[PDB]
Amino acid sequence: LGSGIQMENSWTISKEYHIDEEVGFALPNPQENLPDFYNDWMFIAKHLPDLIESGQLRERVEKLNMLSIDHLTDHKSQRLARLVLGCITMAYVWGKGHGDVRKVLPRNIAVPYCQLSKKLELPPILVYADCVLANWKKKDPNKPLTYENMDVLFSFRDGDCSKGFFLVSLLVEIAAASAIKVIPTVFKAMQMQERDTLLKALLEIASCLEKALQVFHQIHDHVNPKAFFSVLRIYLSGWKGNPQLSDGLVYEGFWEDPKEFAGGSAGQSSVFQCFDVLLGIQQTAGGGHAAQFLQDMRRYMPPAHRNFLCSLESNPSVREFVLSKGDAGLREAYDACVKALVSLRSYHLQIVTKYILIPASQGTDLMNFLKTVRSTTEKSLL
Numbered sequence: 001l002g003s004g005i006q007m008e009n010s011w012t013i014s015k016e017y018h019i020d021e022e023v024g025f026a027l028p029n030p031q032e033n034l035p036d037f038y039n040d041w042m043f044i045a046k047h048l049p050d051l052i053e054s055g056q057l058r059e060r061v062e063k064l065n066m067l068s069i070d071h072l073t074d075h076k077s078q079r080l081a082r083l084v085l086g087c088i089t090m091a092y093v094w095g096k097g098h099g100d101v102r103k104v105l106p107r108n109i110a111v112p113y114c115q116l117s118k119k120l121e122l123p124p125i126l127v128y129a130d131c132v133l134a135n136w137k138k139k140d141p142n143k144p145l146t147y148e149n150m151d152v153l154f155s156f157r158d159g160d161c162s163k164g165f166f167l168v169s170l171l172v173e174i175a176a177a178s179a180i181k182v183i184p185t186v187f188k189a190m191q192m193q194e195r196d197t198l199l200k201a202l203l204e205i206a207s208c209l210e211k212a213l214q215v216f217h218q219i220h221d222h223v224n225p226k227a228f229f230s231v232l233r234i235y236l237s238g239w240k241g242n243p244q245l246s247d248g249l250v251y252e253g254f255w256e257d258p259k260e261f262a263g264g265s266a267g268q269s270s271v272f273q274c275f276d277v278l279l280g281i282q283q284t285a286g287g288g289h290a291a292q293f294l295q296d297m298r299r300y301m302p303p304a305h306r307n308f309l310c311s312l313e314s315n316p317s318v319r320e321f322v323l324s325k326g327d328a329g330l331r332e333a334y335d336a337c338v339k340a341l342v343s344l345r346s347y348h349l350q351i352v353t354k355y356i357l358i359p360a361s362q363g364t365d366l367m368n369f370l371k372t373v374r375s376t377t378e379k380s381l382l
Ligand SMILES: C#Cc1ccc(NC(=O)OC[C@]23CN(S(=O)(=O)c4ccc(C(C)(C)C(=O)O)cc4C)C[C@H]2C[C@H]2C[C@@H]3C2(C)C)cc1
Pocket: 126, 127, 128, 131, 132, 168, 169, 172, 173, 216, 233, 236, 263, 264, 265, 266, 267, 268, 269, 271, 272, 348, 351, 352, 355, 356
C-alpha cells in the first residue's frame, strides 16, 4: 500500500487502473448495444437529434418505464448505459438550448442513472469518460484506429460537430497511450540505474506527446467554431454555479433536494496531469480556487484513473533523478517531454481562444489560467 504504481507483472501496470496498453485512459472496444432489455433507452439516445429538433424528446422520456440496472452485468455494459442515460439527461434538461430548461429529471431516468453512477463512483451528469472515452466504435474491426475508420455512438444535434470534437479528443488520448505504456519502464530504469533505458523511455514519451499534439491539430478540420460554441457546448453544460439551475437538478426518486454537478471541463482528461506528475511539474495557476476546481474535476474522472494519478505522485521523482546527474542525454530527453507538454498546453490555449473565447465575444480568468499553466510548464525546463 502506498508504494507507487501497482504492477500486474514485470512489464505492465496493474489492471486495477483500467488503463489499456493500446487506448490508454479510453475504454477499449466499447460496447455499442445494450441487452434487449434496454432497447427503449437505446432508441431515445440514437434519435436524440431528431427528438430534440421535433420537440419530442421530453415527452418520450416521460413515457419511459423504469428499467432496473440489474441486467448491466459487466463494466462495459455499465459504461454504455451511463453514456446513454447521460446523453438523454443532458438532452432532457437543456432541450433545444434556448432557455426552456427542465429542473426535475423524471424518476424513470433519474433512479437507474443515479444507481449506476453510484456503482461506478461517477457523478450523475455526463462526463469526459462517457462522451469521449466510451463513446466510439470502429467502422471496420480489421482496420486501425484512425478518424476515417471510427465513429461516435451518440450525438445531440445534427450539425453539432460532436463526432469531430469527441473523436479528435479520443484520438489524442489514444496517441498519449503510447506514452503511458512506457511509464513503468521509466521507473524501472531509475531503480536499476539503467541510463540508456531511461533515456530511450523519455525520448519515446516525448515522441508520443509530439504525435498527440499533431492529432489535436485535426480539430479544426472536423469542428466548426460557431456550431461548437452555440450548440454542442449547451449539452456539455451542467448545473453547478449555473444561474439557469441555481440550486441544481432534482433527481426525482433519488434525492429529495436538488443537487449541483458540474458540466464538462478539459480538466476531466487525465492526460495533462499524468505527465505533469511524471515529470514533476506542479501547476500553480489560479491559486487554491483553481486547485479546488481541478481536484473536483479529478473526482469526475473514473476512480481507477484517479488512483493511477495518485500512485504516480508517490513514485520516485524522475525530475530529481535527472537533476542528480551531469548527464546531457537525460536532461535533453526530460526536456523533450516537457517541451511537448508546453506545446500541448500552448495549443490548448489556442483552441479555447478560437472555439470558446472568440465565439463568446461575437473570460479573462480563463485565458490567464491557460497562459499561466503554459509558463509554469516552460519554467520546468531543466
Ligand atoms: C461532459 C463532458 C466533456 C468533458 C471533457 C471533454 N473534453 C476534454 O476533456 O478534452 C480534453 C482535451 C481538451 N480539449 S479542448 O478542445 O481544449 C476542449 C475540451 C472541452 C471543452 C468543454 C466543452 C468541456 C468546455 O469547457 O466548454 C472545450 C474545449 C475547447 C480537447 C481535448 C484534446 C487534448 C487537449 C485535452 C486533450 C489532452 C485530450 C469533452 C466533454
